[PDB]
Design a protein around this ligand. Sequence first.
Ligand code: HEM
Ligand code: HEM
Ligand code: HEM
Ligand code: HEM
Ligand code: HEM
Ligand code: HEM
Ligand code: HEM
Ligand code: HEM
Ligand code: HEM
Ligand code: HEM
Ligand SMILES: [Cl-]
Ligand SMILES: [Cl-]
Ligand SMILES: [Mg+2]
Ligand SMILES: [Mg+2]
Lengths: 147, 147, 145, 145, 145, 142, 142, 140, 140, 140
Amino acid sequence: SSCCSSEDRANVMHNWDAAWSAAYSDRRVALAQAVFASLFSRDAAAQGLFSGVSADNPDSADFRAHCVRVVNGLDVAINMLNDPAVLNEQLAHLSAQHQARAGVAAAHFDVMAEAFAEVMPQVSSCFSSDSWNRCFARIANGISAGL
Amino acid sequence: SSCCSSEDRANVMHNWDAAWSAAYSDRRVALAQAVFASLFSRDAAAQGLFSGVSADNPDSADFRAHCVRVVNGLDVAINMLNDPAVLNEQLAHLSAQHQARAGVAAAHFDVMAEAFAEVMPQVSSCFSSDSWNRCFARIANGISAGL
Amino acid sequence: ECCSRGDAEVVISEWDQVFNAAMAGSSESAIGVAIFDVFFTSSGVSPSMFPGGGDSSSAEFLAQVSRVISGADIAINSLTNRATCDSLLSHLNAQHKAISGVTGAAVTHLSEAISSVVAQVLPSAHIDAWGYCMAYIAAGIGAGL
Amino acid sequence: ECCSRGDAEVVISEWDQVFNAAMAGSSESAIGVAIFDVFFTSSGVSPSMFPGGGDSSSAEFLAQVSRVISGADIAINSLTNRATCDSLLSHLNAQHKAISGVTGAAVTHLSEAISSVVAQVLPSAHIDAWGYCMAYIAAGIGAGL
Amino acid sequence: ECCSRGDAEVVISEWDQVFNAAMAGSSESAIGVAIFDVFFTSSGVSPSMFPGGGDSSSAEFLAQVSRVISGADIAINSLTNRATCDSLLSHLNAQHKAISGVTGAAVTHLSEAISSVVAQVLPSAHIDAWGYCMAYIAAGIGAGL
Amino acid sequence: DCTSLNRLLVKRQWAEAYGEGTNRELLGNRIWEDLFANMPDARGLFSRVNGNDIDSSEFQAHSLRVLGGLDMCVASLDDVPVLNALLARLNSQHDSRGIPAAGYPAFVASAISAVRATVGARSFDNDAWNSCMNQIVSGISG
Amino acid sequence: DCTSLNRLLVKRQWAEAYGEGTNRELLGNRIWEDLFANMPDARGLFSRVNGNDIDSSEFQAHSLRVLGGLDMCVASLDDVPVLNALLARLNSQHDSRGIPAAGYPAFVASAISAVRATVGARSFDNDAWNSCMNQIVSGISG
Amino acid sequence: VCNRLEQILVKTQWAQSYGEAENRAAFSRDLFSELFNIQGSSRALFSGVGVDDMNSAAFTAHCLRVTGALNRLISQLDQQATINADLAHLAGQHASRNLDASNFAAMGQAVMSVVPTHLDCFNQHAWGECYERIASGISG
Amino acid sequence: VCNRLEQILVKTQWAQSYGEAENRAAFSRDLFSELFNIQGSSRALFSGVGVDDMNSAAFTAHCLRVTGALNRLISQLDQQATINADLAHLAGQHASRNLDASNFAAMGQAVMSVVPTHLDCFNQHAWGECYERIASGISG
Amino acid sequence: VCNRLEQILVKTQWAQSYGEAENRAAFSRDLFSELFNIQGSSRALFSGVGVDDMNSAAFTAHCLRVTGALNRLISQLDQQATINADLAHLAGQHASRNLDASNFAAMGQAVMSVVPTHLDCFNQHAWGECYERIASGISG
Ligand code: HEM
Ligand code: HEM
Ligand code: HEM
Ligand code: HEM
Ligand code: HEM
Ligand code: HEM
Ligand code: HEM
Ligand code: HEM
Ligand code: HEM
Ligand code: HEM
Ligand SMILES: [Cl-]
Ligand SMILES: [Cl-]
Ligand SMILES: [Mg+2]
Ligand SMILES: [Mg+2]
């Protein structure tokens, strides 16, 4: 399990910041929509877990709001990479929230990671794949702990 | 009607600041006294409008206080030249005050402008006449609006 | 001068502050529709004379709004090169001469709507420099109208 | 030393802070009259020995106050060039030798009035450096008195 | 352009090299008389049309030479501000319009005499920039002649 | 009203105040310090996240979640259906926490002051910020 | 008493705090923010000049007029007859505006704190500033 | 053509090149200089805008109109109905010019040659797709 | 008036001020700004050279003509017959202007107010004498 | 002589020259250097203050006394009764020196030659008037 280094965190925070639309939700929705389309293609059963947010219509306001929440949650975590004490509390918070959702399992996080790995090079310039992979693992593993 | 430009405002604020006595009222009184002496020479009837401030004795405390108020009012306006939104409220305020004085007319402001144009080169070093003329107009026209 | 090099720099800087890295590319439509709303009120010009009849729900009018904000952008950004700006304005003038019912007064109203909306989204705006420079723009677009 | 180069620089800087661009040229009379008020109280010297009898309403005394503040200014500003300062002080010494009833103790009282008034208008004043440097000034003016 | 900003800077620099701190104020007459000698040869214009009849021993002609070199100096030094230069040239144009027998061709010959004498005293002179910029000067002075 | 031009101003100023990740903590601290000074009894609502030590990791993570919540809403101000779905969820997250209604106007005041302090008073528009913040808290609070 | 030496100190420190035109607004804002925090009901007296939005053009012009008024008085501290004529006019400008007497000591405290913040605490003299400000407000307030 | 993710790359990279250019007139003239150098026969199409002197006010104004149009289009890539209308308008403006596919291809090469020299990162494919979206709309 | 040694001081000090000025147009406009500020009534004399806008091409051109004339005169202070002829020419150019002694005095004050602010060293008397030489020649 | 407005110019310009001088002793010595260079016969008047060596402590002290006096006078130009008294005092101090009008004229030239080289802006007339005010008071 390769470590998400200080250098990796710098790379990831740079890629993430450079691609961010700070005043409008449309870009983060598009990013997340692509991630979910990939996730659901890879694991058709996973879509049922999202019935509470209208996953059956990914263009719905309900699902688009979920997309905003997910990208927000990841944005907050990424921005905490240089303060891991705080990161740990955030990931523990997210973990509790996912524990509360019946059927969400650690294996799903591996599929989610594949989905981000596919989508990020399509939205980020000079995207650093190795640093992303290691630091996404750092974050995802924290959320998936206990499930 | 030639515009009081950003460059003009810089020139005027510089001339004004360089000649200002920041801690004592004597210099601003002398400046204003010279302006009023010029105004009253040019327009003898105008002096009657100032009967409420002892214009008949320009060396009186009453008239010297008026001089302080006038130079203050112009100092505040000049210092607002780089914030015209705020300038507009100040000139509207001054306009209302002059509207409240029976007999004060727009023509008087032209005579006042002549008086300042005569006096400023006698108190200001490297005085920029064109910039002063344009920016004094900007201020005076705002006060004389509606009369 | 009227719209001096210094005035032009202030106006360009303030337009750039409105359309900064966060806002550029995402806010043009909202800024543009607001400019048109102020323009219609001040000028009394019929929305029906515009593509899509001035309806903000119509793609034809939204495309018109995109063109107008972009045209304003191009003119504003060229304010420090007066010869180039004069040419841009002459081109816009020709385009409006070909359109029935564009008046000099109405061109003035639209230019002042740009300034007023800018001051609404950017409270610190130098309203004098905007007035002088938008008047120069209006004079060029509205020439002979 | 007593009134070192460093002490002298502090004193000069603080005198300049009191008589800065806003205050220089307009505040000398008020500073001077206050110095004389403190001096008369501490020294017991008769106001009648001065031009205009120490009356602050008299132009003759106001002119005396102007001379004294200026003399102090010249000495203070020369504190970092000791040879020049010594000469200024010797000239002042000759002037006071020609005046009946100037004592060494009284010269000390006036020098300390300068320091005390400075500290009143400038709360942050380095009272030690003022003491050392005004003592050097008093020693020179008051020599043989 | 013809006589670009860059060309103008070269010409101004080279004129300044000729009339540098050692030479300025002492060499104008000699430079000027030489310019006139080349001009008279190339243009066929009569010396008699000039003050003092073109006689270099005559104070009236020497004063004319002083005026011409100074006029050239003023125009050359304003080459980087085209609007100001155009005005200087229009003034000179009016002055020559009032003089019988000044032709466009002759104005060209005098401008080229300036360039040629400059190249004689300054071997490194940029003869192309001098040609372009002196042609701009000649066009202005010689307008309508 | 939180008008179209208000939303444009609030979006731009929020992006300035929050757009760079470092000093997100500085913005949050400005809010909580002010809120707890004005409404000390509010501190107790945050016991689970260590509200006595706002500098603690637990509180700092909470603070950054709050700012992220605000970011979601500001980013979505132009899309009312999405905004309403975001506020619906925030409402669920605040109900039955014993939060007094007075806590919301207090937070709005603290947040506006914090943004104002960050972006500078000369560019600020209190009317725009109040109107838009009030739209947000109306969706969250009972 | 506002003594001759007090007046010298207040003049010099005022000129430092107010003498450069930029940051006149910063000095004013320090006063109003403090005053309205300590005396919230005072904000209502300024309704005509948009006291709810101290950053508004209307309020900022008012703020700068107030500072100009103070400048006139400080500049004239050495000339009591002129000072009295200035205060007489200021008195007319404040009468029948429903201003409570308590508003004046509050403003004096806010103004002194603002100047102190601007010029630095080490050079400051609270006694001088209180004495001289009290002379001023005594002429303005009923 | 020109999907929602490709649009993110192109918007971001246009912002970092055109959006950050210190001399917008020079950037815009460079586009046309590259166009003429790629396809010499294109230059004559611009005889109505002072092209004989590329530093002229007239030609510079044309260049600025073009990059301003590229900017306004890129801003609307995600608003299908709006950009379609705007592209139709531009198509009307180019209809009488009797342009051909080689002309649009050369302009694409010019855009994609100038833009990356202003960037640390450039995505060729996304730019090709979104340039195609614009070109097809204008060719009509 | 204006002896051979005085000429040395004036030539040297003109070289160090006018001669070294980075902005000759600004130097020349400053001369006239000081003139008008010294004697307000002089300004109207210049109504034929665009004086209403001192930054105009027309007025700047006038100012440059004047300092250029000062330069060419200063260069010839030592050549009596030549400068006398040149001064007579200028006298002809000013004859119809109905100038008076106060006008020449004000111009002398302007020259002697501008020049020393560009110098480390200035000799008032030499400048007064050589200005008088020029003024007397032009007044005619 | 030396009106209230002229006083403003002179006070401001003295503040910007003397008031801002980094080396007050050098400024003051320069005044006397210019005086002696203007009127060589004036130098011998200063034989009691070590004038043979202008860099001496004795001569420098004299120079500082003089510019300090100029400073204290300029500060009181607006206080007629006070400056009149101070000028009378100085007149008493100069009475035994048998000075003449040429000496006061030369000092005026020295003052007005040194001061403007320390300034961006200088008003010759105001300085002449206020120097005359001082000189007349001291000449007695
Ligand atoms: C690093 C990756 C992830 C992040 C940052 C993330 C973040 C979030 C956030 C912020 C919420 C909203 C929580 C709430 O309001 O209760 C959420 C909800 C949810 N997440 Fe994730 N998540 C991640 C991965 C996953 C994975 C891999 C799955 C499983 C397939 C998953 C399943 C869910 C479900 C079912 C919900 C509830 C949706 C609803 O509101 O009905 N998440 N997630
Ligand atoms: C830019 C130029 C001017 C400025 C800045 C100015 C400023 C002022 C100010 C600050 C006041 C005191 C207001 C109050 O306390 O009510 C005042 C009063 C007055 N002004 Fe002006 N003023 C200007 C021009 C004029 C002109 C041209 C006239 C007409 C001749 C005029 C006539 C008066 C009168 C009659 C008063 C009332 C005096 C009194 O208190 O009895 N002002 N002005
Ligand atoms: C500062 C003022 C104005 C600016 C910057 C401006 C700008 C523009 C621009 C850039 C275009 C697109 C031209 C093209 O590509 O064909 C346009 C078109 C148009 N403008 Fe204006 N305009 C202004 C004022 C006005 C006014 C006052 C009116 C109405 C009275 C008006 C009516 C129109 C119409 C009808 C079109 C044509 C729409 C079409 O059918 O294609 N404009 N304007
Ligand atoms: C630090 C201490 C002192 C300083 C700096 C000082 C400075 C001066 C100066 C500069 C003068 C003007 C000299 C001139 O131009 O003729 C003067 C005069 C005078 N001083 Fe002092 N002095 C000091 C102490 C004293 C003391 C202690 C006394 C009294 C006991 C005194 C009594 C006088 C008198 C009577 C005059 C002459 C006034 C006249 O008739 O012209 N001084 N002093
Ligand atoms: C580049 C070309 C030239 C320059 C820079 C030039 C410049 C001047 C100047 C500065 C003056 C003085 C004007 C005044 O103050 O009245 C002058 C006068 C004169 N120029 Fe030229 N000139 C040029 C060409 C010519 C040519 C080609 C001729 C003859 C065919 C000519 C004939 C004269 C004459 C006769 C006068 C008038 C002398 C008098 O009676 O006062 N100039 N020129
Ligand atoms: C615009 C205003 C506000 C926003 C955007 C906001 C946002 C949030 C967010 C995102 C969370 C975390 C939700 C979760 O994942 O469980 C939260 C939790 C919380 N908020 Fe707010 N909030 C706002 C105002 C307030 C106010 C005014 C109060 C009370 C005075 C308050 C009290 C709380 C409490 C007590 C929690 C739970 C802390 C815990 O985890 O134990 N919030 N808020
Ligand atoms: C030293 C203290 C003060 C000074 C120098 C001062 C000065 C001023 C000045 C110059 C004006 C504008 C007058 C005009 O042109 O109409 C003004 C207006 C006003 N002042 Fe004061 N003021 C002081 C204290 C206060 C205090 C303590 C209060 C109340 C708590 C107050 C309340 C007002 C109000 C309500 C206005 C009118 C606002 C309006 O235009 O509607 N002032 N003051
Ligand atoms: C695909 C990207 C293109 C964009 C965004 C674009 C944009 C524009 C714009 C905005 C105008 C000015 C319209 C007006 O206001 O009248 C214009 C004119 C023109 N364009 Fe394009 N254009 C593109 C491609 C091309 C190509 C590939 C060519 C030919 C090689 C071309 C040739 C012309 C010509 C000849 C004009 C008319 C110039 C004139 O007025 O004489 N354009 N274009
Ligand atoms: C003593 C130094 C002076 C010099 C070297 C000088 C030089 C000149 C020169 C070179 C011209 C342009 C001649 C031409 O080419 O037509 C001129 C024009 C003129 N000068 Fe002077 N001048 C001096 C003093 C004055 C004074 C003291 C005044 C009046 C206050 C004055 C008023 C004028 C006027 C009115 C013109 C005509 C402007 C026009 O063309 O309308 N000059 N001067
Ligand atoms: C008008 C401006 C002048 C001022 C402000 C001035 C000021 C002074 C002062 C302050 C002293 C020292 C008095 C003392 O403490 O004993 C002094 C001394 C003297 N001054 Fe002047 N002075 C002026 C002009 C002149 C002129 C024009 C001359 C002659 C060219 C002159 C010749 C002297 C001499 C000879 C002494 C005596 C030196 C000694 O002690 O041997 N002063 N002056
Ligand atoms: Cl996007
Ligand atoms: Cl004064
Ligand atoms: Mg911590
Ligand atoms: Mg504001």
